[PDB]
Amino acid sequence: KNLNPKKFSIHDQDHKVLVLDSGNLIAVPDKNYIRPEIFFALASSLSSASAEKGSPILLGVSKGEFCLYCDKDKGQSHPSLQLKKEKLMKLAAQKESARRPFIFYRAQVGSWNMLESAAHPGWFICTSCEPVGVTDKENRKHIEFSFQPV
Amino acid sequence: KNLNPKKFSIHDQDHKVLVLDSGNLIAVPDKNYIRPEIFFALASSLSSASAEKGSPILLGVSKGEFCLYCDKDKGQSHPSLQLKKEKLMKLAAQKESARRPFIFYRAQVGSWNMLESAAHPGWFICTSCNCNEPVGVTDKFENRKHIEFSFQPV
């Protein structure tokens, strides 16, 4: 659980870039005139954790004024992906119940990365062909992300 | 042409910004993550200049190399502006006949700026109405905010 965030930008393997567009996280092509959204990742272990998957981290956009979670409301049959007006430096200091929907699992592979949820396992982060959502598989490059540093 | 050029971004008065996409200059909505293409203005001169037409200026895109200019290539319908792989410091000295297509007439209007070509005066540089088009040149318009441009320096 690092006190210092590891800032970076997120790309995918269909040549796109993740930016925050009016409070909504979408993926657009990787043109030069795009200022990628800089995310603030940082480790955060889970007590009753799980194997087979990678390292648990938190996620936050725009320095840290908004964070990622995945809860499944009433609702939309599947889980979803929304933002939260909650500072990131306040998150890792909470317990285990409030940290769970915001915890993701970065499974390292090659130059690629992929974020599996924690509250709803088997549900990853994906792009489409247009906002960013979650998936329970059905493609490949829409899950393998390349993290280029700031 | 004073010492050193001027740097700014071409925001048209329809809330779109000027950026360079795949070697072509387009106009996208000025969004909170769009990196506006920084232009380089060196005020040029034309001994056979036209009255009322503003100060002659040649323009460069993305760190000097690549200047814009109006011409009439093979046998098309109308003139059009393009981009030539040439350094801005190098172009400003070549012959008046060589600089002529690259010179543009900048006539300020308050916080705004007109931009008429020197190779083909009467044709003003312009943007489109739908917000995701390449910036071109026109001689008859249908809105003011597409030739009237803001030059916000950063």
Side-chain angles (χ1 to χ4, degrees), chain A residues 1-94 96-150, chain B residues 1-94 96-111 113-154:
Chain A
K1 303 182 178 180
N2 321 283
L3 297 179
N4 199 24
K6 235 61 174 298
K7 308 102 101 74
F8 69 107
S9 72
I10 293 178
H11 302 233
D12 68 0
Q13 309 301 130
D14 216 318
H15 288 332
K16 290 226 189 65
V17 144
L18 278 69
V19 283
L20 184 55
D21 181 90
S22 67
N24 291 258
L25 186 61
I26 99 281
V28 289
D30 202 339
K31 283 302 181 300
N32 52 323
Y33 56 82
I34 297 293
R35 289 143 168 171
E37 181 68 23
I38 40 263
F39 305 85
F40 279 55
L42 73 175
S44 176
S45 75
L46 235 59
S47 58
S48 56
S50 32
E52 323 108 47
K53 51 216 291 189
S55 307
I57 73 277
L58 281 344
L59 231 26
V61 298
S62 71
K63 186 74 176 62
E65 274 69 40
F66 294 91
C67 291
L68 290 176
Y69 76 139
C70 163
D71 70 325
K72 170 182 173 62
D73 264 81
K74 175 208 62 56
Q76 67 294 74
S77 304
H78 350 286
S80 184
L81 195 68
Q82 317 94 306
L83 297 186
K84 186 62 59 265
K85 188 76 189 69
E86 245 199 20
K87 275 169 285 184
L88 175 61
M89 289 299 186
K90 196 193 106 308
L91 203 51
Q94 256 80 93
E96 196 88 350
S97 61
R99 273 172 53 208
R100 174 175 176 81
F102 303 84
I103 282 277
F104 294 83
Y105 284 77
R106 179 200 177 185
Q108 282 260 214
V109 141
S111 180
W112 337 67
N113 296 277
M114 42 199 304
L115 282 310
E116 184 188 9
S117 176
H120 298 59
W123 291 84
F124 291 71
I125 294 189
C126 70
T127 66
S128 168
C129 293
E130 55 285 63
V132 177
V134 287
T135 188
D136 66 329
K137 147 75 70 271
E138 200 170 278
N139 214 256
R140 186 172 70 98
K141 297 83 32 180
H142 304 73
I143 224 303
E144 288 181 296
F145 293 146
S146 48
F147 294 170
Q148 272 55 80
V150 200
Chain B
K1 20 191 171 182
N2 265 269
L3 310 135
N4 310 340
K6 179 189 175 185
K7 315 90 174 296
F8 48 93
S9 48
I10 319 289
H11 308 250
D12 77 322
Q13 303 222 126
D14 215 323
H15 302 129
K16 290 184 256 64
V17 80
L18 263 268
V19 288
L20 182 69
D21 185 297
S22 295
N24 203 333
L25 205 63
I26 71 177
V28 307
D30 194 2
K31 196 68 76 60
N32 66 285
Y33 50 76
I34 298 289
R35 204 132 43 194
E37 196 56 72
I38 283 297
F39 291 73
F40 296 85
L42 265 194
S44 185
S45 59
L46 207 71
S47 59
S48 65
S50 305
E52 186 267 358
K53 280 72 190 299
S55 33
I57 292 177
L58 44 79
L59 295 148
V61 186
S62 67
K63 307 162 183 298
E65 29 247 353
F66 273 134
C67 313
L68 45 151
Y69 75 108
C70 183
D71 72 328
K72 185 71 176 55
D73 209 73
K74 205 181 100 301
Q76 52 278 130
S77 175
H78 73 327
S80 173
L81 99 157
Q82 303 163 8
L83 294 168
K84 274 305 151 299
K85 194 174 187 177
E86 191 166 3
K87 247 165 273 71
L88 207 284
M89 290 294 302
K90 180 179 180 178
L91 179 88
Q94 305 204 15
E96 175 174 50
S97 60
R99 297 173 308 185
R100 170 159 197 277
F102 292 78
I103 287 145
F104 286 81
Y105 282 136
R106 174 236 198 176
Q108 311 186 43
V109 180
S111 72
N113 291 265
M114 298 286 277
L115 270 171
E116 195 194 57
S117 171
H120 301 76
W123 291 68
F124 271 85
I125 223 182
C126 81
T127 77
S128 175
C129 178
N130 196 33
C131 40
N132 235 277
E133 305 276 15
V135 287
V137 289
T138 194
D139 63 317
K140 42 186 67 272
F141 67 154
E142 207 154 67
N143 202 321
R144 289 179 288 97
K145 313 163 184 292
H146 304 148
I147 303 91
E148 213 53 278
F149 297 144
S150 162
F151 294 176
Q152 287 137 244
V154 192

